[PDB]
Amino acid sequence: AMFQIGKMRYVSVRDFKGKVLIDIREYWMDPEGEMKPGRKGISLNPEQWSQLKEQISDIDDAVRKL
């Protein structure tokens, strides 16, 4: 499953060899016309995703002060 957050950026959910991964990644279009994952991105495990969500408020507060 893919969820768009930018023109060429998505959050994807997948089971990778038995591990749940939540990837936040940029994608590109290659010379052959194929959509490919980019070097910019990161794949979060369950606990990392859980902690990201738990601190959304603190993250937004930080953004706001900027």
Q: Which residues within the stretch 14-33 sit at the binding site for its own copies (CB under 8 A)?
A: 14-15, 20, 22, 24-26
Round to whole Å and give the CA distance between 7 and 61: 26
The answer to whether 38 contacts DNA (rule: CB under 7 A) is yes
The answer to whether 51 contacts DNA (rule: CB under 7 A) is no
Residue type, 11: V
Helix (H) or strand (E) holding 4: strand 2-6
Contacting positions for DNA (CB under 7 A):
6-9, 12, 14, 16-17, 19, 21, 23, 25-26, 28-30, 36-41, 43-48
